[PDB]
Enzyme design. Structure first.
Site, PDB file in Angstrom:
ATOM      1  N   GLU C  60      -2.017   1.448  -4.846  1.00 45.56           N
ATOM      2  CA  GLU C  60      -2.584   1.148  -6.148  1.00 45.56           C
ATOM      3  C   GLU C  60      -2.159  -0.242  -6.585  1.00 45.56           C
ATOM      4  N   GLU C 137       7.664  -4.871  -9.662  1.00 50.33           N
ATOM      5  CA  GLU C 137       6.743  -4.326 -10.644  1.00 50.33           C
ATOM      6  C   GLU C 137       6.727  -2.828 -10.539  1.00 50.33           C
TER       7      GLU C 137
END
Ligand code: HEM
Lengths: 49, 51, 446, 57, 105, 54, 423, 54, 105
Positions: C60, C137
Site C-alpha cells: 500500500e 512512514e
C-alpha cells in the site's frame, strides 16, 4: 506504534475437539456444551431425587 | 385496562409465548406428580407401579 | 411509479463481461461525465499469510511509490497533472483503487492502470528511501488506536489467528521488510487473475474490451504456480482483554455479533437483524423517542455514551454490533441490554420493526446503490465475493422474501447460545466474566 | 441560479438526530495525513464518527 | 365552588367546608393524589405557579399542625379558582395519551 | 366509619350465640363487607370521583 | 429510455417563493428546502439559535408531537435533516417516494409547525453543550473545526455552535420571534427531486405561504483582516494564515477559484508530494515537514476572502509562514505557464465536475443543484463560463491578494511563529 | 433497568451474595462459614422439627 | 536475600523458599501488612514503580490460584533487590514521626 501485541497458545489446556485450525466448531460446540450440560443435568436430576 | 396488553402486537406476543407456556406448565404438573407421587395419578403409572 | 421493485427494474441494468484471460471486466455505463474509474486494486487487508505479514500494507505504501514507465513525480504528472484520483481500500481478500476522471480521459488512466498493474517498481533508492519512507512512514505510522478499538475489534476482538489474522503484521517484520517480500512476495503474491477490471461511469464496455486488449490485456497470463490454500475453519480468539488503562479517560466501549463477510446466505436477514439491532449514535438526538428500545432506556437511564451496531466481516461469519462509550457503569446492563435485547430479539419479534429495518435496508439500499463509488466498489466486491450481482430485484427479492418466522428461528439458528465479540476500551471492570458476561451469554429469562 | 456549496474540507455544519453531525463545507484543510508515526487514537472521553446506512437493490 | 359545586364541589366547598380543602383554602389542582403522570406533570409546571402552590402547600401544613384554619373570610373565594394545571395537566393527559397512543400503536 | 359500623357490628353479631335475628343480621353484615368494602366503598369511590368535577 | 429525460423545472412561486420542482425520474426520493435562514440572515439579537434550531427540528411541534413526529420520522425511517450553512438551512428528506407526502406533511409540519415548548426547550438546552462538544471535538472538530472556531472569524463564524456567554439563555420568545423574525418566504426555497412538479405544487399551494426577511451583509464584517490570534499550546502547532479572494457571484469569483486551483488543495489521488503548487510544489521545494495552506471562499454576495489554512509544527512557522508569504510574493510574480492555466482548468474544472456529481453528492452536489445551483449554466454553460477562464486577471489578481488587508489566524504560541506585524 | 440492580430487597441481596465483588485469590478457608449457617439452619431446622415432637 | 539473609531473610529466602515470598519472587516492600501509614505511603508511591508492584502482585495472585510457582530460576534473584518504598516509606516514617512529632509537641 500501538499495534504490536500477540496472544498465547491454549493447546496445553485445550480439549481435543478444538485441536485443529482445520475445522469449524460449528460441529463441536453443541457437543461440548452438550457434555457439560449433561453433567450438569446429572447433578439436577440426581439432586432432585 | 386489558386493552393495554390487548392488541395484535401483544396478541402476537402471546402467540410467541404459547408453546413455551405449555412447556413450563408441563414442568409444574409433572413436578406435582413425582414430588407427590399422589395415588390419584400414581395409579396410572405403569412400571412406575411400585407394587 | 413502477414500484420500488419495478423501479428496481426501472433502475437501469448494469452489465458485466469476461475478458479473455478469463479476465473479468464489468460495466456500468452511465451519464457520469466524470467517473470512478476503478482499477480495482484487489490486494486487501486479510489476503495475506503469516510470514507474509505487512507486505500488503507495505505494498500500500508502495502502491503509489513511483515506477518506471511513469516515474514518481511523473505518475504525479500524467496522474496529478491530470488531476486524477487514486485510492487503495484494502479488505479481507481484495481491495480497490479509484480513478476519478473525465470520461473523456477514460483511456489515459487505464494506460496508467496498466503500469500500475505492472510497472510498480521496488527501487533500491525508494526501497532505501521511499522505503525509508516505508521503514519510517510505515514504521511508526502504525499506531491508530481506534484501530486499537474498532481494530481492537479487528486487531484484537478480531484475533490475529491464521484465519483471524490481523492486517499490518509485525514491527519486527517492519525491520524485516524484504524485496523478497516485494521483489519476491509482491510477485510471489500479486496475481492478476483475481484482479478486478472495474467499470463505473459513463463508458463503453465494447471500448472496455478494446482498451483491455490495448493495455489491460496481458495480465493474468502469467499467474498460478503454487500456494493457493483455502480457509480451514477454526475458532477466532474468543476472549477479552483490557488494555488496562487508568489512562483511558472514558470507555470507548463496543461489542459485535456476526458481521457480514463474503459468503453466507443467512446474513440477508441478519442484515435486517442487525437493522433491528441498529447503531445508537452519541451525536444522535431524540432518545426519548428512540427506536432501539436499548437506545431508549440508554437515554432514560442516561445509560451509556454510545453504541453502534458494527458488522465485522469474514466469509460466512463475523461480528456486527455496537461500539459504545460509558463511564465506570454501563457495560453490565448494556449486555443486559445487548444480549438481553438479543435475548429480546431471539424471542420478541414483531413484524413492525421487521418492516421498519426493511425500509432501512431499502433507503440504505439506495445509499449503497445510490452513489458512484459506492456502486463502484459495490460492483468490485459484488463479483469478487459473489461473482454475481444481486440484482435490484434479486437483492429486493430475498429482501422481498424477508420472513420474520426466520427471524425467531433463524435468529435462534445463528444467534442463540454463542460467544461473539465484545470490546470496550478502558477500565472494563463492568466487564463481567465469561463466567458472568458470557454466563450472560446464556438466558435465564428462560 | 442560487448556489450554496462545494469547496471541500471547510465547515458549514450538517447535523440531525436520526443522523449525526458534520461540516464538510466549501474550502480545504483536509491535507494533514502524511507523516510517519501515523499513530491515531481511541478509548478516552471522546466522540468519534463515520456512520452511514447503505445497502442494495 | 358554588352551590351545585358548593354542594358537590361543595364536597370541596360547603362539604370541604366539611372535608376542608377549599375552606382550608387549598388548591383544587393540588388535591390530585401524587402519581407519576402527576409527577412529571408538576415537573413541567409553570414557575410563578410553582412558588404559588408552594406557599399554599406549606401554609396548609402550617395550620394543619396548628390544627386551625384561616378566617372563614380568609377561607378561599368560591368558584373563582383558576384551574392551574388543567391546561398543563390535561395537556399531559394527552401526552401520556400519546406515549400511550403510539404505545397502543 | 360506616364500614367500621359493619365491623364492630360484626363483633356484637358474634356477640350473640346462634340466634334467629342474628342469622339474618350477620347474613347481611357479610354483604356489607362485600358491599361496604368491595362494592359500596369502591362504588363510593367512583361516585366521589364523579362529584369531583376537578 | 425515459420520455425524453425530464429537465429539472426551475421556477419561482408567483408569490415570491422559490418554487423548484426538479423532475427526477430517479428511483429514490430527494427533498430539499433551501432557507435564507442560513447564517447570513442571522442577527446579534440571538446566539446559536441556529445551532439550536439545527438541533431543534426534533423539538415539540405545533400540531405535531415531537414524539409522534418522531413516530412518523422514525416510522418511514428516512433522511430528514435541515442543513446548516451560512446561506441556507435546508430541510432534506431522501426516502421511498411513497411516504413523501407524509414526509411532505412532516416537511410541511417540520417547516411550518413549531410549538417551541418551554419545557421541551429547557430540556433541549444541554444537548447543545453536547453539540458544542462535538463541534470543537477532534483535530477535525478541533484543529479543523475548533480551529475553524479558531479559524472562522466573522459572522460566518457565528457558530454552528452557540456562544458560551450566551449558554443556556435561549428564549421561546426568541423562537417564535426568531423564525417570525427570520423564517419567511424570503427564506423560502423548495426543491423537489423525484416527484411531481404538479404534486409538489399541490402541497406547495395548499400549504406554504410566508414572507418577512431583513437587511445587511455585515460591518464589512468588520474588516480587521488580521489575526484572530489564539494561544493554543497545540503540541504540533495549528496555525492558518489567511489570504483573501472575492465575493460570491463576483465576475472574478471564478478567477478566484482559479487561484485556488493555482495553489490547489488536497489531491484527488492520495499520498503525494503536493507537487502541484507554488503553495505546494514550492511548499514541496519549500517545506520539509507537515504543512498545509489553502484558500477559502467566504462568499457573500457582497464580499469574499480565500485564506490559506495552514498546518505545521511550531519551529518553522516563521520559516514556513514567511516562506508562505514569500511564495505568495514569489507567486504574485506573475510567472505562470499556459499548461498551468489549462491543466488547472482540468483540475479545478473537474472540481466543478465531482463537485456537481452523484446521487448523494448529487443531493449534496447535484443537490447542491437540487438545492444549491439554481439552473444549469450547464457543464456546457457553466464550464463555458468556466471555459471563460482567463489568466491575466489571476496576475492582476496576484497583485490584488497582495494588495489588501487579510487575516492571520493563530493556534499555538508564536515563539517560533510570526505575528504578521513583525511579518 | 436490571431488577438485579433495581429491586431494593434484592439491592441488598445482590449487594450481599450476588453482585458481591470479592477477592479472586480466595481460598478454601471459606467453606466452613456457610456450613455453619447451613449447620445453624439445619440446627434450627432439626431442632425445630425436633422441638416439634420433643 | 543471602545466606545470613538466606537463613534469616532466608525466612524470606531459603525459608521463604519455605515461607514463599522471595522464591515466589515477591516484592520485599510489598510484604508490609497494609496500614494507614502504609496506605498513604503507597498513595505517594512512584508511578513506574506502581506499575511494577502491580504486575508483581497480580502475578502472585495468579500462580497462587494456580498454586504453582515460577521456575526456581524464575524464583527471584537473591539480594539484588531495591528497597522500593524504603526511601519513600521510611521518609513517611519520618512523616508520621513528624505529624507524630509536633503532635508530641
Ligand atoms: C433454635 C433451633 C434449635 C432448637 C429448636 C433446638 C432444640 C433442641 C431440643 C429440643 C433438643 C433435645 C432433643 C434432642 O436431644 O434430640 C436439642 C439437643 C441439642 N441441640 Fe439443639 N436446638 C436448636 C439449635 C441448636 C444449636 C444452635 C445448637 C448448637 C450447635 C444445638 C446443639 C444441640 C445440642 C448440643 C443438643 C443436645 C445433644 C443431643 O442431641 O443429644 N441445637 N436441641
Amino acid at each position: 506504534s500501538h499495534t504490536d501485541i500477540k496472544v498465547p497458545d491454549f493447546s496445553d489446556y485445550r480439549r481435543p475437539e478444538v485441536l485443529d485450525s482445520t475445522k469449524s466448531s460449528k460441529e463441536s460446540s453443541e457437543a461440548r456444551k452438550g457434555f457439560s450440560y449433561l453433567i450438569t443435568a446429572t447433578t439436577t436430576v440426581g439432586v432432585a431425587y | 385496562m386489558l386493552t393495554r396488553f390487548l392488541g395484535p402486537r401483544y396478541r402476537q406476543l402471546a402467540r410467541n409465548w404459547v408453546p413455551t407456556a405449555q412447556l413450563w406448565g408441563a414442568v409444574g404438573a409433572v413436578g406435582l406428580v413425582w414430588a407427590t407421587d399422589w395415588r390419584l395419578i400414581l395409579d396410572w403409572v405403569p412400571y412406575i407401579n411400585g407394587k | 411509479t413502477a414500484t420500488y421493485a419495478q423501479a428496481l427494474q426501472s433502475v437501469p441494468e448494469t452489465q458485466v463481461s469476461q475478458l479473455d484471460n478469463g479476465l473479468r471486466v464489468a460495466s456500468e455505463q452511465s451519464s457520469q461525465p466524470t467517473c470512478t474509474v476503478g482499477v480495482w486494486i484487489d490486494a486487501g487487508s486479510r489476503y495475506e499469510t503469516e510470514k507474509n505479514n505487512g507486505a500488503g500494507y507495505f505494498v500500500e505504501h508502495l502502491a503509489f511509490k513511483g515506477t518506471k514507465n511513469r516515474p514518481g513525480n511523473a505518475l504525479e504528472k500524467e496522474v496529478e497533472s491530470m488531476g486524477a484520483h487514486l485510492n487503495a481500500y484494502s479488505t479481507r481478500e481484495h481491495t480497490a483503487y479509484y480513478i476519478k476522471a473525465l470520461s473523456k480521459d477514460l483511456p489515459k488512466a487505464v494506460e496508467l492502470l496498466a503500469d500500475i498493474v505492472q510497472n510498480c517498481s521496488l527501487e533500491d533508492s525508494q526501497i532505501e528511501k521511499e522505503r525509508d519512507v516505508i521503514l519510517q512512514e510505515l514504521q511508526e505510522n502504525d499506531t491508530s488506536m481506534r484501530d486499537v478499538v474498532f481494530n481492537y475489534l479487528h486487531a484484537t476482538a478480531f484475533q490475529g489467528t491464521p484465519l483471524a489474522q490481523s492486517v499490518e503484521g509485525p514491527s519486527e517484520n517492519v525491520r524485516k521488510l524484504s524485496r523478497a517480500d516485494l521483489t519476491e512476495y509482491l510477485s510471489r503474491h500479486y496475481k492478476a487473475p483475481r484482479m478486478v477490471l472495474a467499470a463505473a461511469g459513463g463508458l463503453e464496455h465494447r471500448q472496455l474490451l478494446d482498451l483491455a486488449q490495448k493495455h489491460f490485456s496481458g495480465l493474468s497470463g502469467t499467474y498460478d504456480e503454487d500456494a493457493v490454500p483455502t480457509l480451514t475453519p477454526c475458532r477466532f480468539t474468543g476472549s477479552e482483554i483490557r488494555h488496562r488503562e487508568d489512562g483511558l479517560p472514558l470507555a470507548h466501549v463496543a461489542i459485535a455479533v456476526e458481521g457480514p463477510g463474503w459468503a453466507n446466505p443467512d446474513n440477508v436477514a441478519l442484515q435486517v437483524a442487525n437493522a433491528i439491532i441498529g447503531h445508537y449514535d452519541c451525536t444522535y438526538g431524540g432518545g426519548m423517542h428512540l427506536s432501539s428500545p436499548l437506545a431508549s432506556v440508554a437515554v432514560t437511564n442516561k445509560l451509556c455514551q454510545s453504541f453502534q451496531t458494527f458488522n465485522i466481516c469474514y466469509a460466512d461469519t463475523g461480528l456486527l454490533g455496537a461500539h459504545f462509550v460509558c463511564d465506570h457503569m454501563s457495560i453490565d446492563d448494556m449486555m443486559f441490554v445487548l444480549q438481553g435485547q438479543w435475548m429480546r430479539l431471539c424471542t420478541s419479534a414483531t413484524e413492525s420493526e421487521v418492516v421498519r429495518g426493511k425500509n432501512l435496508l431499502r433507503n440504505a439500499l439506495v445509499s449503497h446503490l445510490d452513489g458512484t463509488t459506492p456502486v463502484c466498489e459495490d460492483i468490485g466486491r459484488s463479483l469478487l465475493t459473489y461473482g454475481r450481482r444481486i440484482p435490484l430485484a434479486e437483492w429486493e427479492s430475498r429482501i422481498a422474501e424477508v420472513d420474520a418466522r426466520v427471524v425467531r428461528e433463524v435468529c435462534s439458528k445463528y444467534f442463540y447460545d454463542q460467544c461473539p465479540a465484545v470490546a470496550g476500551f478502558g477500565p472494563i471492570e463492568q466487564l463481567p466474566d465469561y463466567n458472568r458476561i458470557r454466563s450472560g451469554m446464556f438466558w435465564l429469562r428462560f | 441560479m442560487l448556489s450554496v456549496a462545494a469547496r471541500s474540507g471547510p465547515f458549514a455544519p450538517v447535523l440531525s438526530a436520526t443522523s449525526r453531525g458534520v461540516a464538510g463545507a466549501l474550502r480545504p484543510l483536509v491535507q494533514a495525513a502524511v507523516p510517519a508515526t501515523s499513530e491515531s487514537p481511541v478509548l478516552d472521553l471522546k466522540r468519534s464518527v463515520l456512520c452511514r446506512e447503505s445497502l442494495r437493490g | 365552588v358554588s352551590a351545585s359545586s358548593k354542594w358537590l364541589e361543595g364536597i370541596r366547598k360547603w362539604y370541604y367546608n366539611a372535608a376542608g380543602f377549599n375552606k382550608l383554602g387549598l388548591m383544587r389542582d393540588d388535591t390530585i393524589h401524587e402519581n407519576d403522570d402527576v409527577k412529571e406533570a408538576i415537573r413541567r409546571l409553570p414557575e410563578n405557579l410553582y412558588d404559588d402552590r408552594v406557599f399554599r402547600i406549606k401554609r396548609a401544613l402550617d395550620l394543619s399542625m396548628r390544627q386551625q384554619i384561616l378566617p372563614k373570610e380568609q377561607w378561599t373565594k368560591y368558584e373563582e379558582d383558576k384551574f392551574y394545571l388543567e391546561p398543563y395537566l390535561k395537556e399531559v393527559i394527552r401526552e401520556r395519551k400519546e406515549r400511550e397512543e403510539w404505545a397502543k400503536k | 366509619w360506616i364500614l367500621v359500623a359493619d365491623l364492630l357490628t360484626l363483633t356484637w353479631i358474634g356477640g350473640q350465640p346462634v340466634e334467629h335475628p342474628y342469622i339474618i343480621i350477620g347474613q347481611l353484615a357479610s354483604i356489607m363487607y362485600i358491599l361496604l368494602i368491595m362494592v359500596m366503598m369502591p362504588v363510593a369511590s367512583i361516585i366521589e370521583n364523579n362529584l369531583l368535577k376537578w | 429510455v425515459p420520455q425524453h429525460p425530464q429537465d429539472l423545472e426551475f421556477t419561482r412561486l408567483p408569490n415570491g417563493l422559490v418554487i423548484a420542482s426538479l423532475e427526477n425520474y430517479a428511483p429514490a426520493s430527494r427533498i430539499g428546502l433551501f432557507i435564507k435562514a442560513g447564517s447570513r440572515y442571522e442577527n446579534f439579537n440571538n446566539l446559536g439559535t441556529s445551532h439550536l434550531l439545527r438541533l431543534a427540528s426534533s423539538l415539540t411541534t405545533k400540531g405535531a408531537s415531537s414524539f409522534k413526529i418522531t413516530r412518523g420520522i422514525e416510522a418511514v425511517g428516512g433522511k430528514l435533516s435541515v442543513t446548516s450553512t451560512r446561506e441556507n438551512m435546508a430541510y432534506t428528506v431522501e426516502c421511498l417516494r411513497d411516504d413523501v407526502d407524509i414526509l411532505m406533511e412532516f416537511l410541511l409540519n417540520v417547516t411550518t409547525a413549531p410549538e417551541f415548548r418551554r419545557w421541551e426547550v429547557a430540556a433541549l438546552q444541554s444537548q447543545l453543550r453536547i453539540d458544542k462538544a462535538v463541534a470543537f471535538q477532534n483535530p477535525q472538530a478541533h484543529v479543523i473545526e475548533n480551529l475553524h472556531a479558531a479559524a472562522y472569524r466573522n459572522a460566518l463564524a457565528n457558530s454552528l455552535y452557540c456562544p458560551d456567554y450566551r449558554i443556556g439563555k435561549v428564549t421561546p420568545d426568541e423562537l417564535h420571534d426568531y423564525v417570525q423574525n427570520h423564517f419567511t418566504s424570503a427564506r423560502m426555497a423548495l426543491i423537489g427531486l423525484g416527484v411531481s412538479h404538479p404534486v409538489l405544487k399541490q402541497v406547495a399551494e395548499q400549504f406554504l405561504n410566508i414572507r418577512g426577511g431583513l437587511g445587511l451583509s455585515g460591518a464589512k464584517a468588520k474588516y480587521r483582516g488580521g489575526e484572530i490570534r489564539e494561544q493554543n499550546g497545540d503540541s504540533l502547532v495549528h496555525a492558518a494564515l489567511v489570504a483573501e479572494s472575492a465575493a460570491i457571484g463576483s465576475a472574478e469569483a471564478n478567477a478566484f477559484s482559479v487561484l485556488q486551483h493555482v495553489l490547489g488543495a488536497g489531491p484527488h489521488v492520495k499520498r503525494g508530494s503536493n507537487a502541484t503548487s507554488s503553495l505546494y510544489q514550492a511548499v514541496a521545494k519549500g517545506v520539509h515537514q507537515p504543512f498545509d495552506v489553502s484558500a477559502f471562499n467566504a462568499s457573500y454576495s457582497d464580499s469574499g476572502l480565500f485564506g490559506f489554512y495552514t498546518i505545521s509544527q511550531a519551529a518553522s512557522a516563521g520559516d514556513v509562514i514567511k516562506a508562505a508569504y514569500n511564495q505568495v510574493k514569489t507567486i504574485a510574480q506573475g510567472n505562470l505557464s499556459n499548461p498551468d492555466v489549462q491543466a488547472a482548468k482540468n483540475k479545478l474544472k473537474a472540481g466543478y465536475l465531482m463537485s456537481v456529481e452523484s446521487s448523494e453528492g448529487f443531493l449534496d452536489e447535484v443537490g447542491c443543484q437540487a438545492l444549491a445551483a439554481g439552473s444549469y449554466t450547464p457543464p456546457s454553460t457553466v464550464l463555458q463560463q468556466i471555459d471563460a477562464v482567463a489568466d491575466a486577471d489571476v496576475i492582476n489578481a496576484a497583485k490584488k491578494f497582495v494588495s489588501g488587508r487579510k487575516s492571520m489566524a493563530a493556534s499555538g504560541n508564536l515563539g517560533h511563529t510570526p505575528f504578521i506585524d513583525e511579518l | 433497568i436490571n431488577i438485579r440492580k433495581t429491586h431494593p430487597l434484592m439491592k441488598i441481596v445482590n449487594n450481599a451474595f450476588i453482585d458481591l465483588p470479592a477477592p479472586s485469590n480466595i481460598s478454601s478457608w471459606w467453606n466452613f462459614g456457610s456450613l455453619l449457617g447451613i449447620c445453624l439452619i439445619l440446627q434450627i431446622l432439626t431442632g425445630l422439627f425436633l422441638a416439634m415432637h420433643y
